[PDB]
């Protein structure tokens, strides 16, 4: 009947079943635990014993504890009743708002669709981010990867991607928070109450997003299965309701990292970088479900963390073959102040064929990449010599690329609290029109810092004359304002008397607070 | 009270294999009959693996192991303030038992999404290289990553010393109670910090959780979690905490020792597979709670030592992924005379200017921009090629600005003084000054400028236009050296 | 001037080929040592299971 725990080593639990072992990938429940502890069968050990990974902490497990087989994998609520809610890895609501409505709960484990029901259709998803929509344009229905090390702007970019393409589109959205900070998952939740994406209370059915969160405090068994839970909410919207759905996954690296934390305890020899041996096929089983089918379409945006600014590392390098657009963010673009710190050369899309986006978009993007590559081959000699022996053909392409570099920078609407500037949404036609001007010399007279953090090319001319006025207005405050104003600046002790003093208690309150908590509860 | 009994099968290298104890929980405190405690970590089908909290010399084959029924816990409360405790609760300063205290678990689930709010109020370090460029809010985990002797401890001690200076001036609610967890350190070194903290007065608000190098490897693995549990008393009851895990690099080495001796298979650099989970379980407990849960905060400062500036290290890469900001300290900046040796080009704060002083949010914005212009023009005049006289202006002004961010090791400046100091350097008032005596020019700028103009900038938190002109008209009635 | 820059820029290709030679010997030593280090990390994780 019911199995009993036989071994607890870290997050990996062995359960011995006297008769009819559960299937691999099936969900088990330990009763008698302090919290709901769900195990998932990873493998059959052989002597009527399964080896399992826990979806919660194994502190407090006892050998001999009763384990109940559910005869099924982990089943989560999917449907319209999850829109506007935050879910667990196992489908529990963690947003403190009742239970989830749960019309047709679904298993988080399934296969990839087929080869026959694949969609060979390419249409551009216009994001508004002009470095994205010029050089590596995203596909409406394809996988998008945001690469980069720690602190280059993977979230700031996936947050600007949320309020640009998910804030007004036809279908629903799912955010899969996979092994990241709980602080920024709370920042994402409260940002979407304010922008009306998630509505609380009786207006909950008009929500357009479902959060599934498996953040960094969760054990490796939990974080390995959150993306499968976020898939399953997005696969109900594609397969059953037949509609378009956006799926944002914050650091799909953490799915591969979580499987490697349990891998050696599952009895597997380590791989080349200390990763699990099944690293390419655990990742491949997840990505091949995030597809556009003949029923609907899943537009996926996955952040990918690279460990030490290292795209050579096998967990980002395996992800590269899965995506249709790989926006690579670089630290050297971030240290220069250009934000979004998108590497303009290393970012590659499959929408960059001339027979897909036209020739007026392909040749501008192929022309911007040529000027930015020539400048990098010249910057070997500029930092040594200093831009005097280039015979003014290569001096022109240094100043053209420096204008192009700042014109890829753009203020984000979600980085108003960071950058301090209002965000800009650049249309696709205004990006092609602007970069064709800088490429063909239409805007050589403007300063190169007039291109920095602006919307389009009509805001570079709106900023260049502003800059000239700003420096021609420096020589006017050198006459007055030092002495004897019109008393809008009063005396010092006038301001000290307006200071409303606080009560500085000087007792700390502590030992009477502690006994007050003691007599309470 | 039936007590389950386990017979020791074998004991070696601080690990004892125990037969029996079927009822024992994973992570449960056990008790040997020699008096030494233990923790049941891997419950195998034939034996229990017990890490020994102490010296395993007193444990013999066939000794009786009793289970205590309880997961590992520490005394938390206000009675731990002022005391020097060991890796799990017990005081080692020779001042008796911990009075007015309560035993709580050391492995608590971190507060989830609905229990947070946004990190908005600032935690002032007193280090003006930090509070201007990489400012730290209350509820934010910030890494102090650096080399073997780059002053990483000094940055952390100045955060603790400065909170005592702030706690005498703020009301009772917004007082920060510090916890310093010293993992794997020398005991002489810890005793120099308790000597410093009683001389400073910072020991009134400080808990000192000490797991030295002589302690067992499960006492240094467990000491960050036991110090965080003492620090989470203030977070959970509406007050504000500040936890400093000095050398989480030395906690992972103590956790690699127990994992390798419990026979767990080694990963990169012979480290456990769940090492990332070792530090993400701990650092995610540093939170800013919502006002339904009290509004309390806990600010973490993990310290990670690199080898040769190799931040691509296994444990170093893990904690850069977990923490919000990063204070990178460089060895060659340390000896160039830049103290603290903060790599401004590599140090970030992911909370950013949302949780910093408004009186420096407008002043230090041009500070980090002029220092960004200073960095690449100093790489080119390193060779000695040529000059531009607009390149030489930002190469000369940023040399004042780099010299302005230098600070004394044991003195933490108040936020009002730092903004005035940065104003006098970013509004050009510390031009006409030699680059060498700006370390001594700003003592005039703090002393001669009125002591009642700091009170207005402290109470408003912002240079008002009725103060923006009044203090720049006092930054001219000051006598600077040389001039 | 051009004939002293010619003798100066041939003394700095010598110096950037002697530095490059000491740096390739240093790189080949680190290339050999990192294949040995990553291999010992694989055998130790395999001997702990077998």
């Amino acid at each position: 009947d019911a199995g009993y725990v036989s071994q607890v080593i870290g997050p990996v639990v062995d359960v011995r079943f006297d008769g009819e072992l559960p299937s691999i990938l099936s969900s088990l429940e330990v009763e008698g635990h302090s919290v709901r502890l769900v195990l998932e069968v990873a493998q059959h050990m052989g002597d009527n014993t399964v080896r399992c990974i826990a979806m919660d902490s194994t502190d407090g497990l006892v050998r001999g504890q009763k384990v109940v087989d559910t005869g099924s994998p982990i089943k989560v609520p999917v449907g319209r009743g999850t829109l506007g809610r935050i879910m667990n890895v196992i489908g529990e609501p963690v947003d403190e708002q009742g239970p989830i409505d749960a019309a047709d709960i679904w298993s988080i484990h399934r296969e990839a669709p087929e080869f026959t029901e694949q969609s060979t259709e390419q249409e551009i998803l216009v994001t508004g981010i002009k470095v994205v929509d010029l050089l590596a344009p995203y596909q409406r229905g394809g996988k998008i990867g945001l690469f980069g090390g720690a602190g280059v702007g993977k979230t700031v970019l996936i947050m600007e991607l949320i309020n640009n393409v998910a804030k007004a589109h036809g279908g629903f959205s799912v955010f899969a928070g996979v092994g990241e900070r709980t602080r920024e998952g709370n920042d994402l939740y409260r940002e979407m109450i304010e922008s009306g994406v998630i509505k609380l209370g009786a207006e909950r059915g008009n929500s357009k997003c479902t959060l599934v969160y498996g953040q960094m405090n969760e054990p490796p068994g939990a974080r390995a299965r959150v993306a499968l839970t976020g898939l399953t909410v997005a696969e109900y919207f594609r397969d059953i309701e037949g509609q378009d759905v956006l799926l944002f996954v914050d650091n799909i690296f953490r799915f591969t990292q979580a499987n490697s934390e349990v891998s050696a305890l599952l009895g597997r020899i380590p791989s080349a970088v200390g990763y699990q041996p099944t690293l390419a096929t655990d990742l491949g089983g997840l990505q091949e479900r995030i597809t556009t089918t003949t029923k609907g379409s899943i537009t996926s945006v996955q952040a990918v963390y690279v460990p030490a600014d290292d795209l050579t590392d096998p967990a980002p390098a395996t992800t590269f073959a899965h995506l249709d657009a790989t926006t690579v963010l670089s630290r050297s673009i971030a240290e220069l102040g250009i934000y979004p710190a998108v590497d303009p050369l290393d970012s590659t899309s499959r929408m960059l064929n001339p027979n897909v986006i036209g020739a007026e978009h392909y040749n501008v993007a192929r022309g911007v990449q040529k000027v930015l590559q020539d400048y990098k081959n010249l910057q070997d000699i500029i930092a040594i010599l200093g831009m005097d022996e280039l015979s003014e053909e290569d001096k022109l392409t240094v100043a053209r690329a420096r204008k192009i570099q700042r014109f890829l920078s753009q203020p984000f609407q979600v980085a108003e609290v960071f950058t301090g500037t209002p965000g800009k949404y650049v249309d696709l036609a205004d990006t092609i029109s602007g970069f064709q001007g800088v490429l063909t010399g239409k805007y050589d007279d403007l300063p190169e810092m007039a291109f920095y953090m602006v919307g389009d090319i009509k805001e570079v001319k709106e900023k260049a004359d502003k800059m000239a006025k700003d420096i021609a207005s420096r020589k006017e405050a050198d006459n007055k304002k030092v002495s004897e104003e019109l008393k809008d600046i009063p005396s010092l002790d006038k301001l000290v008397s307006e200071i409303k003093e606080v009560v500085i208690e000087e007792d700390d309150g502590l030992e009477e607070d502690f006994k007050a908590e003691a007599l309470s509860s | 009270p039936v007590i389950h009994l386990g017979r020791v099968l074998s004991v070696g290298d601080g690990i004892a294999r125990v037969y029996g104890l079927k009822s024992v929980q994973a992570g449960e405190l056990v008790c040997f009959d020699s008096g030494v405690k233990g923790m049941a970590l891997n419950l195998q089908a034939d034996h229990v693996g017990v890490v020994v909290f102490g010296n395993d010399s007193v444990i013999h084959q066939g000794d009786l192991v009793y289970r205590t029924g309880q997961i590992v816990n520490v005394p938390i409360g206000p009675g731990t303030l002022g005391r020097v405790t060991d890796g799990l609760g017990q005081p080692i300063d020779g001042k008796g038992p911990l009075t007015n205290v309560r035993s709580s678990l050391v492995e608590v689930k971190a507060p989830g999404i609905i229990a947070r709010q946004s990190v908005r109020e600032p935690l002032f370090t007193g280090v003006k290289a930090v509070d201007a460029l990489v400012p730290i809010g209350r509820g934010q985990r910030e890494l102090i990553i650096g080399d073997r002797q780059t002053g990483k401890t000094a940055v952390a001690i100045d955060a603790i010393i400065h909170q005592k200076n702030c706690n005498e001036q703020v009301p009772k609610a917004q007082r920060v109670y510090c916890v310093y967890v010293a993992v794997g350190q020398k005991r002489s070194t810890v005793a120099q910090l308790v000597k410093l903290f009683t001389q400073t007065g910072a020991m009134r608000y400080t808990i000192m959780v000490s797991a030295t190098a002589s302690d067992a490897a499960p006492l240094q693995f467990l000491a960050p979690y036991s110090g965080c549990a003492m620090a989470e008393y203030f977070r959970d009851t509406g007050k504000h905490g500040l936890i400093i895990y000095d050398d989480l690099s030395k906690q992972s080495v103590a956790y690699r020792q127990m994992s390798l001796l419990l026979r767990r298979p080694p990963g990169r650099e012979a480290f456990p597979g769940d090492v990332f989970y070792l530090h993400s379980r701990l650092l995610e407990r540093a939170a800013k709670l919502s006002k339904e849960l009290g509004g309390g905060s806990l600010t973490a400062f993990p310290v990670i030592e690199t080898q040769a500036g190799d931040v691509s290290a296994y444990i170093a890469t893990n904690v850069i992924s977990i923490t919000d900001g990063q204070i990178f300290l460089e060895t060659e900046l340390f000896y160039k005379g830049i103290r603290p040796a903060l790599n401004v080009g590599l140090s970030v704060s992911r909370v950013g200017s949302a949780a910093q002083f408004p009186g420096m949010k407008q002043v230090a914005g041009t500070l980090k921009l002029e220092l960004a212009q200073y960095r690449e023009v100093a790489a080119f005049a390193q060779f000695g090629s040529d000059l531009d006289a607009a390149t030489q202006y930002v190469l000369e002004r940023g040399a004042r600005l780099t010299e302005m961010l230098k600070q004394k090791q044991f003195a933490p400046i108040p936020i009002e003084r730092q903004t005035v100091a940065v104003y006098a350097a970013t509004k050009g008032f510390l031009d006409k000054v030699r680059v060498q005596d700006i370390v001594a020019a700003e003592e005039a700028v703090i002393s001669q400028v009125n002591p009642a103009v700091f009170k207005i900038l402290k109470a408003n938190g912002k240079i008002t236009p009725a103060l923006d002109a009044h203090l720049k008209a006092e930054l001219r009635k000051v006598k600077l050296p040389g001039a | 001037e051009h004939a002293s820059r010619m003798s100066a820029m041939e003394n700095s290709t010598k110096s950037a080929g002697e530095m490059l030679g000491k740096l390739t010997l240093d790189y080949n030593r680190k290339r050999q040592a990192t294949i040995t280090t990553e291999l010992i990390e694989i055998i130790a994780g395999a001997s702990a299971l077998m």
Binding site: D310, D380, I381, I384 | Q307, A308, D310, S312 | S12, A16, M19, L20, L23, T24, D26, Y27, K30, R31, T34
Partner: peptide, 15 residues
């Protein structure tokens, strides 16, 4: 630390 020694061979080879 095997990329810092590889980016110096990037420097000295172009110098």
């Amino acid at each position: 630390s095997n990329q810092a020694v590889k980016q110096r061979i990037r420097a000295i080879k172009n110098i």
